[PDB]
Every structure is written in structure tokens, then in C-alpha cells.
């Protein structure tokens, strides 16, 4: 919802994923994307523990 | 013994360092860095073009 | 440059964690500084820190001095007197921490 509000489509291909849209992604939402994917990985780790 | 427990906490601080690298501020800084380097790359490439 | 950013952000974060420990253990300043440097190195490079290689070996147990530490070693050999440096074998290679 925070990405599509900027007109960017969140393309997913697994736990890692990118964005599809016009022009390069600004820093804030790209940071959010890589933040949430790192958080998902570490969250699976803490899930297993 | 106090030194031992303190150094045990410091050793456990590896997870704190890892979770610092998923935080908003550090990741925003990293994305700004890579974005400025990238845009330098595209400006050089378009000058060549 | 991103490795430098990771290292200096880690150092900035660990300053607040080591300064109270610096005050608490001024005599351990060298060890704490070395450990902070190792943590920064792990933060930037990503090399997994070995807890067995950075855990201070508490050879002595804090004694009140009354009674004072009295050790009797009738079977006084060099490993039993000076202490032996133990080793571990991985892939047939001697190693220690």
C-alpha cells in the first residue's frame, strides 16, 4: 500500500522481490523493500528458533 | 564474573548489530549511498551515449 | 564504501554499549577496545565471530584471601604446574582458542 500509492507495482518472485514501475525507485521505498525482505528472512530464523 | 557476563552480552550483541542493519535509518543511509553511486553511473553512461 | 558505512555505524552504536563497560572495567580497556574492533569487523566483513575465541578465560576464582588461595600439588608436572594449552583437531589440523 505504501508503494502502490507512489504508482509502483510490487513484483514478487519468492522471499526476495522487486518493484515494477516508471523510472528508478526512490531511496525510501527501495529501502523499505530491502528492509522488509531482510526482516522476513530474520523472522523466519526467529520463527524456527 | 561481572566481566564474564558483560562480555557474554557483548557476544550476544552480534544479533543487535544484525538487527541494526535492518533498521530504517541505516538502511536509508545505505540506499542513499547506492543511489548516488548509481545515478553517477547512469550520468557517466548517458554522457558516453 | 558500504563496508565502511557498516563498520562506522557499528562503532557508533557500540560506543554507547562499551562506554558504561569502559567505566565499569577501566583495567579491561585494551580487551574491550579489541573486542569492539572485532565486532565492527564482523559487522562490515560478515565473518562469523567465534565465542570461544573471544571469551576471557577465568583461570582464577575470586577468593576473599581469608583463607588465602592455597594449592597443594603433590604430583607436580609441567602441565599440572604451568597449565597445559589445550588443542582441538579439525580436518586433522591442530587448533586452539
Q: What does the alpha-carbon distance between residue C54 and residue C35 come to, in Å, rounded to a whole number?
A: 7
Grid coordinates belonging to B23: 533498521
- What DSSP character marks residue A3? T
In B1-49 the beta strands, taken as DSSP E runs, fall at none
Please give the span between the terminal C-alpha atoms of chain C, in angstroms, as a whole number.
32
Distance, CA of A27 to CA of C14 (rounded, Å): 26
Closest by Cβ to B31, choosing from A30, A39, A42: A30
Nearest to C21 by CA among C11, C32, C10: C32
Q: Which H or E run includes B10? A: helix B2-20
Give the best residue of B4, B5, B13 to mutate against chain C (max C CB count within 10 A): B13
Amino acid at each position: 500500500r505504501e508503494a502502490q500509492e507512489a504508482g509502483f507495482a510490487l513484483s514478487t518472485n519468492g522471499e526476495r522481490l522487486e518493484l515494477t514501475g516508471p523510472g528508478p525507485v526512490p531511496a525510501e521505498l527501495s529501502a523499505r523493500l530491502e528492509e522488509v525482505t531482510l526482516g522476513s528472512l530474520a523472522a523466519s530464523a526467529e520463527l524456527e528458533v | 564474573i561481572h566481566l564474564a557476563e558483560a562480555v557474554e552480552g557483548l557476544l550476544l550483541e552480534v544479533n543487535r548489530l544484525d538487527e541494526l542493519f535492518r533498521q530504517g535509518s541505516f538502511l536509508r543511509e545505505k540506499t542513499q549511498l547506492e543511489a548516488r553511486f548509481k545515478e553517477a553511473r547512469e550520468q557517466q553512461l548517458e554522457a558516453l551515449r | 564504501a558500504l563496508r565502511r558505512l557498516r563498520r562506522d555505524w557499528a562503532l557508533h552504536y557500540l560506543n554507547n554499549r562499551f562506554e558504561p563497560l569502559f567505566q565499569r572495567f577501566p583495567q579491561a580497556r585494551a580487551y574491550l577496545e579489541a573486542l569492539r574492533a572485532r565486532l565492527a569487523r564482523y559487522a562490515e566483513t560478515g565473518e562469523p565471530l567465534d565465542p570461544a575465541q573471544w571469551r576471557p578465560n577465568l583461570l582464577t576464582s575470586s577468593s576473599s584471601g581469608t583463607p588465602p588461595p592455597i594449592v597443594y600439588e603433590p604430583y607436580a608436572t609441567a602441565p599440572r604446574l604451568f597449565g597445559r594449552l589445550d588443542y582441538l583437531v579439525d580436518r586433522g589440523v591442530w587448533s586452539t582458542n
